[PDB]
Amino acid sequence: ALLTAETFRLQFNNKRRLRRPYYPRKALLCYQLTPQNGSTPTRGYFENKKKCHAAICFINEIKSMGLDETQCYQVTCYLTWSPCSSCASELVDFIKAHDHLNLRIFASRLYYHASKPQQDGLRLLSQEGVPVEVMGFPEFADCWENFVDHEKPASFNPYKMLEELDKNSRAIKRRLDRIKS
Ligand SMILES: [Zn+2]
């Protein structure tokens, strides 16, 4: 299952939105499990469901895969919104449980307004060794390359989109760095 170009552009657009998002907080998560021995990487994505938030559905997917724990793995997660406090705590517990699994978290946007629970969740994830980094051009390009359907042409120019995303990420990186300590 692959995303469309328009869905990718709408979800990962990091140009600071003006009109507040309405409930529920729609959040996309694309993940890539890469086996370190070289076998086929597994890719997927999850949205916010009333059943589970994207991070929780991702954690449950990794748990249900039943990984060969004699191997080592690299996991990369591209999120549209950075995780909330509860998802951050669940991710910290998931990181601690799996010492054969090196996790990297990237986020397109952090949040519309700053909050103590979300900032403390991000600080907890940072102290555990998996800080929520901001997506730049390499991360947007990798997520575009591997998760979008390219059999059919896009309705827009992808290079201008990647340029706009990279341009907007520069200030969001400063917003993230002002907090991290
Ligand atoms: Zn959440």
From TrEMBL:
Organism expressing this protein natively: Homo sapiens (Human)
Annotated protein name in UniProt: single-stranded DNA cytosine deaminase
Keywords linked to the UniProt accession: Antiviral defense, Cytoplasm, Hydrolase, Metal-binding, Zinc
Family: Belongs to the cytidine and deoxycytidylate deaminase family.
Coiled-coil residue windows: none
EC class: hydrolase
Cofactor: Zn(2+)
GO biological process: clearance of foreign intracellular DNA; defense response to virus; negative regulation of viral genome replication; transposable element silencing
Locations listed in the record: Cytoplasm
Domain CMP/dCMP-type deaminase, residue spans: 3-124
UniProt cross-references to InterPro entries, sorted A to Z: APOBEC/CMP_deaminase_Zn-bd, APOBEC3H, APOBEC_Cyt_Deaminase, CMP_dCMP_dom, Cytidine_deaminase-like
Molecular functions (GO terms): cytidine deaminase activity; zinc ion binding
UniProt GO cellular component terms: cytoplasm
EC number annotated for this UniProt entry: 3.5.4.38
Known catalytic reactions: a 2'-deoxycytidine in single-stranded DNA + H2O + H(+) = a 2'-deoxyuridine in single-stranded DNA + NH4(+)
Stored Pfam families: APOBEC3
UniProt keyword Hydrolase, yes or no: yes
